[model samples]
Target: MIQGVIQKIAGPAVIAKGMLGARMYDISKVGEEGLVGEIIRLDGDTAFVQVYEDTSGLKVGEPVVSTGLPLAVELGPGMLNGIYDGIQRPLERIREKTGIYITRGVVVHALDREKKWAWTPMVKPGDEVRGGMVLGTVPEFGFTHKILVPPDVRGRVKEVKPAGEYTVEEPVVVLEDGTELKMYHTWPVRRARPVQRKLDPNTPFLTGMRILDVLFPVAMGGTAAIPGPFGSGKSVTQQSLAKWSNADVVVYVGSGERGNEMTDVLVEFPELTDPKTGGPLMHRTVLIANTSNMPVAAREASIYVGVTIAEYFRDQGFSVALMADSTSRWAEALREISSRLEEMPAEEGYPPYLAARLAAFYERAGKVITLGGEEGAVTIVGAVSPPGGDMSEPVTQSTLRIVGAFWRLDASLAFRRHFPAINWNGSYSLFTSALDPWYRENVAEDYPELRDAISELLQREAGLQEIVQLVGPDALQDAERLVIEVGRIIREDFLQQNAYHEVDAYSSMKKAYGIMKMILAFYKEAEAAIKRGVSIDEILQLPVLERIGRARYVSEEEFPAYFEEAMKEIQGAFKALA
Candidate 1:
């Protein structure tokens, strides 16, 4: 290990440059172990590292080693089916020989602690055992890597192994009974937090936006992923859900994550008070943060940490909804591990198990297979940012195949200053059909009608856009102009809410429904009158929406103003439809 002098300090970070360079990453996992820190910012001869655990012991003249190269996870066939939190522990696959990749988790501070865990035992790394064997005990700190043994008593010992980088997995352990246990296995993956009863997603989930009300809607206990590019408000979207979703519990997993975001989390998370409990959002929420500066090898572990927590909550009978800001970063961590392990690469230099790795997480986000024989589901909304805004990327394509629902956030629309930027045409909700019988009855035309209407609206919008592209707005007919205008209204009304801003789920919806009724009733009457040869001007002149708007309690005046434009656009849409 070489030593480096602290050149300068910036905020909570330190500055140092060296040939035998150290890492400049900010590690944020809160465990007490030595498996801490990673290189985040590499400056000219200046490498900065972020330590996962508290750096109370680190000093200005502290000795640091380069390891002669960049820090990479030691990968081989070591980690498979292992249930590791902040480090790899091969217990899940004590008898199987299959391999699985997990999110990397940097030990908050990996240090030897003499406590409950049986670390200094009579076994070597390759010593295998059978079923019903006590492999090891929990380490002194409740937040480090601890392994579990198998039930077989006839497994052979291989060799003293290293827990370094070898693609940390548990299935690598070969027992003497000539059998292996694969780890990456889970019976049920995603379950909602604070889960008490087995109930279908029947409650109407309101985004309080007209676009979803008149078009696509989110049901309770349903999983929806929002895929968008960087700076597209994906994080803000998760924050909104944390505030607005009437869900009992919100488990947020900061996976494949970064620093500035974690900083924002530490500061802003406290500001979030539960609408129900009035406590801080972080209090009601459990955060499993494995940010970017943390070891890339442990990035994958963050996902499992989330699932395990959700499961624990579910067992305690809680409905938990988890949000992974971006699973792609977890995938990237897998890539980094594989590259260091020298494993056979797949598409875009990712591991061969990329597809399976992505699928496992999505598959876990399902209705509970068994609950007091009732359906329990973990609605996972992962913000997947396709690199370069390209959905055609391998990771995104594979993700699409596993998760039935896709809520896309279009960059073009986002670039135009629209917020959430959800591409209605591009996103679909499969759970629309999963609504309870009673709830499904109220939706106009049922679930099928919602889809059909949205499709029709999308097609019309596409045609209108083409016309606008070819000829100036003045060149179009009133009907053509109207469709374009309403289309814009729809875009602005729904799928455009600011991610960082949150509204009361109940009150917002009440306001939303009222607004919808005013628009829908006016449009229906105006369309009928137009059919009877009534002038669009005559219908537009009626202060129908304004009266409704004035009659209702108003929080944002934009709703009433939108109704005005909506009436105008409704008349136009009717012209085109007629």
Candidate 2:
């Protein structure tokens, strides 16, 4: 080990001398407490280390030892249903050993060390095995956790363990070259896992939210950014997605958010049942909780910790969705570290490489053919908390340049109690055209057209409202007035969804399509009635409108019957008006 002495201490950044052999990004033990840190810069014999814990009382000339390993995560079967800190330390274990407040330099493994898993080997003797090749499988919370060869190893299987119980660190397979393969492996957090090739993300990642799934859809393996202000339902929207999205595995990183928010996830996930698997939601979920009160340097590492874990599952041929709640705090961590490092500041006192760093983090999300030749994906949905609800801030602007879908939340809509608060005019999805073919094959054939039609009507409503405020609603023609009323219906009934309701919390594509189709049918009938000289007030007062407004409350089983009855009611109401 390369041992050095701390020459200077600057908050989380510690400058040490006599670290000539240590490489950048290597994990280092700083000060007498052996607090965890990473070498950020190397200059001659001096290494600048960013400690991942509070560095309050360390004198000059304190010892700094390099572990000679980069910041890495242990990937294995026990990852699911586990809550970890930013550095991958199991929080429950820490709580058991050191109480609730984590003591500095407390060491704990991320996975359980005593528990044994039933492993069933898939490869036989003399079988050719390479990096990412499946060697065995273990049952993990109803999931077939495929044991893959480390990405840097390759050999022919010489001996394989029989189907039996083994701990994650036990060697289960031996290669012809005498290399041992274990159930779990370590991977560097900053580097992405290798893949054979990336595929075009064409399939929609259904979130079961009308505003996102139908309007601003993100494709499987796509990247999305949710920029919102305080109390704009950003956390609730992410929580709803984590509960209802169709991803096989979920990695939620609470990156520098509130402790209560992470606490909410940690408390609620265990009790909630998975909508797809019928097991506990935590069965397929991995949480990295790095709240604002934690060490800021660790907050910068939390997102990488999450995406790395997601990619590991993706390599196992499972679709993984990673949610980073509020990257703004992560960015602030970067700014704080950069300021301590004396780097030149860019816009808003952020480092000049903020955009590059953001791009690198987001580019890790994609659909890819794993080295094992199986198809998988990692979809990243990052939440950005902009200051004072300003979208023009540096972090938000930089994120907008990289993500494929942007779900911009509006404070006005949030103040009015809209659950998602996603602004139709401001939010957009680049994957809509790419996902149209999949929608046609699985959803309705006219799904794209219906989405476009809704977009046009909402856009028209914004334009018409300006004139209505200037000259009053009496100046507009009857057709324009019909547009205004239909737009209102679309907004109040179709876009807004209740996140707490049992049936209404999740909407299947069929149900989403049915609700939208009914709303447009009403618009068509209302437009026709207005041209036929029926008054706008009479059309708006029709009793069928109430049924259309409450269509979201209908259960999925009864939606077909409700849609048929509602369609007939819409035609009859307009026919009577005519």
Candidate 3:
């Protein structure tokens, strides 16, 4: 509590000719040196201080000092990464219109621009008002606007009109007998929700076949988390997500983290172009980064900034995928501020509303008929790096409670050379079942048995992977060996391949069919040939096994017949194989 003297009061900001300019902070709404102030503004010539912690005790003649420094916005864009409780300063340099900055209470009823105004409130002449309480909604055809009360710094509202319509932005409520005041431009329209029509997610959210697709499939709007110790592939996975996911736009928040990787992302991202569209991918990407070097206050605002950007895109009617790497640091930032404020905290000394805050951010998604009544969606996928890979921690547990689908990327599997390392069987879906019927439509009649057979074989491979660790691979029979080989091919060739071997969606579907047809046919011939004493390699290497893969997957039905005709055209092709 540095005891300095109050110099003077100016407009929104107060100028203090102090020694603390070398440092910065958000003194607004904060008390210092055993004194609290509203801090309407902070700039040169005055630190406009309105005493919240009883300025009544302070006198114009008395001397007062600051706690330490002026408040600053943690800069460098990473602030949008996660939820932080630090102070936020506007980007004064950027030439965009910003929203109102309000605190908890201050009944705001009217908004005005150049003497034009509109107002809402059912208050009687003596009715009271408080900040942040929602005034009634004004329903327009497309958007519904509601009014809000700014921070109720003056504590209580005095009066309001009993009858006639007040002009917009006109003063609606006064506090402490008309000293404090607030006016706002109408609030942004609330997002609308429609019926929850659950359907199968059939459109493949291509992860470019390189990382997630071949190794692990993450449907659009799906949720997953990767937990690993330091030096594990958490950030790499995130970078891969930025590249591969079929999302039209990517909104990445750095949260409270280092600037190094975030800087790398910002610099390197522009070079990555879409394989499908042949344009730079980052053109549709937005980043909110706040590095360790940025102000703590900016860290706090970054989350809201990121969310505001996401909501804006959602309003724009695009499916936005937002990935925040490590929400835990933001939680820590909140806890730090709350501690300084002497507020009581809950489990792990975090605010009780932490989970609720997280849910509110996640719930911003849904097939919302937006305020504009368009079919727009916001899909949020956040990462949590548990302290020491401890999934039992509160953050992980709480997040898991809200999202239905979970893809748990395993560290052990990764250590064992699993690239994506997803525990596929452990991951289940609530919504894809809605899409499975559509997917099933692609299956041929014979696929019922083939699918069942493949599932059983995969199940067997899972068992074999475990047992071979105990008894060694020498115990396996020759017949059982073929199934293992087939399993390896699927995992290696089909699932693991990525942009390095990206195939078109049409090609994938066609190839899937061809392989299904060829596999069934090959199974019959291989068993017959093996029983007739042909070498296992000779039977397995039959031309049919290679056709599914060698043939280009043309959607035209002629593709399969073309392969058949090509074989028949070589009059003695089979005779030469002997």
Candidate 4:
């Protein structure tokens, strides 16, 4: 480490002279353990550092030391079930070792050091291995702890250890080139791991949310943005997805979110069990918390920290979904840091490169063939909270330009107490067409056409609602009245779902198909009933119509029987009316 003198100090930023060797993003210690910081600017022999901890008590002429390495995260076992701060420091450990508040330059391993884990080597001495290949596994936490070949290394194995209990730091393999392999590895969070080739994201990432799975689907490696106002259920929706989405791993970045919300996740995750594995939910999850009380500079780094960890798992051929709860906060952090650096602002005092930076982040998400010859993906779901719920704001607008799917949350619907509040007219997914093959082969053969028909009905409802609002419903024709009534059924029965409901919270695609097909069947039966001289009012008055609403609660096994009975009763009712 090279030492320098602090020339000046700003809020969370320090100017250090005689650091000519300092590079941008180089991790550094400032003012005698005053804080851990990263070099944001290096001008000639001067350096600008953004301190991760509070920088309240420090005088000029204090020593600054540069570590000559970018801020990186140590990846391995024991990361799961651990609560980390924005910089990947173990928060629980910090609170245990230090106190409630964070202190400067306190060192802690990202993984537990003393715990000895059973390890089994999968490679022999003459076997070839590459980065991201699973060289061994430890059966713990009810899941396989894959000891992967470190990223950016490759060679023939020169030595392999036998199955035994070992700490994370103990060497398990050695390459012919003398490169050591341990259970833990450090990676710069700002960099992307190497990949053999990028692949098309054809498979869908199912969240079991009917509105998303059936309407606006996100591909396995796709990018999606949920833009919503306060109280629009954005955080709840994200939390539900993190809990239920069928990804092998989840990386949740609570960037600039409420402290209580982050605390809730930290507290609740351990008690929850994964539906797929029956293991603790944290067994496959890593959380990065940068709550409202955290420093802005650290908030700026949290997203990268989360994504880098996601890419690490993706390289291991795991399907990983990463959720950045509020990229708006990260953008605001950039704006704050940019203002401190005296840089010129573009829109709303945000940095001019906001769009470019957003693109770079989203571009990191993709389905890829890794160097180890396994297929993996990283799906990104970023939430955007615009100021005053305005979509025209710079952050939301830029995000819309880059993301493939947009789940726009409506304030009016939220006010009406609709759970998800996703506006059918505004929200859409580009992956629907691409994901049709899987849906057709797995769920139903007519799934894609069914989606199109449903979307068209909603679209027609949107246009007709505007006219009805201006001219009154009585002025509309009989067919128009039918459209309006049918649209209501679709809205309440199809789109609106209670996030807190026991059965309604998660709907399998097969169950969704049953519900949707049943709704359309009722619509079709009603449309034909109107043509057979039945009044729109008479057709709407059938008691059988109420059964469709109740079917959402029916168990999947019982649904087919219930739906079939409802269909016969509806046909007999309409026949009796005729």
Displacement of residue 394 (Cα, Å) in model 2 is 0.9
The lDDT, on a scale of 0 to 1, for candidate 4 is 0.82
lDDT comparison, 2 vs 3, better candidate: 2
What would the TM-scores of all predictions be?
0.59, 0.93, 0.59, 0.93
Tens-digit lDDT track of model 2 for 1-578: 79899999978889999987999899999999999998998988899998888899998999999999999999888889999987788988989999978798998887787889999999999899889999999999879999999999998999999999999888899999999999999999989899999989788888989989999999999999987577687767877888898788999887787788678778877887787777788889999987877877778888888889999999999889998877888888888778767777776768988889887789999999999999999999988886667776688889888899998887778999877888988899989888999998998888889888988999999999989999998899888988888888888888888988888888888888988899899998887777788888888789999898888998999999999999999888888875
lDDT tens per residue, model 4, 424-525: 878989888888889889989999888778888888889898999999988887778888887888888878776667667677888788778877787888
Report, for all candidates in order, the number of backbone clashes: 78, 0, 50, 0
* Candidate 3 lDDT over residue span 1-578, tens digit each: 43344554332223343424322342433223334343434466345454432233333334444544333222111222222222232232121233333232122211122342234454444545544343333322122333344323324556653333444434555554674333342111122122223223443344443323322344455554444345445655566656666565677766677657556766676677654467766656667666654544345455555555555445434566777665766666666555545577776768876788667666555534344344445566677766476777677777777664555667665676654555656554444434435446753544335544545556777778777789887897655565676665444433333322334222343345454444444444444554566666665565544554444433346666754654453333334444
Model 4: residues with Cα > 4 Å off, grouped in runs: 3-24, 40-48, 59-63, 268-273, 277-280, 563-570
Model 4's TM-score against the true structure: 0.93
Q: What is the C-alpha lDDT of each candidate?
A: 0.50, 0.88, 0.48, 0.82
lDDT for 344 (candidate 1): 74
For residues 484-536, write the lDDT of model 1, one tens digit per residue: 54444345443345443444232354345445444444545654765577776
TM-score top scorer? 2
Best candidate, lDDT: 2
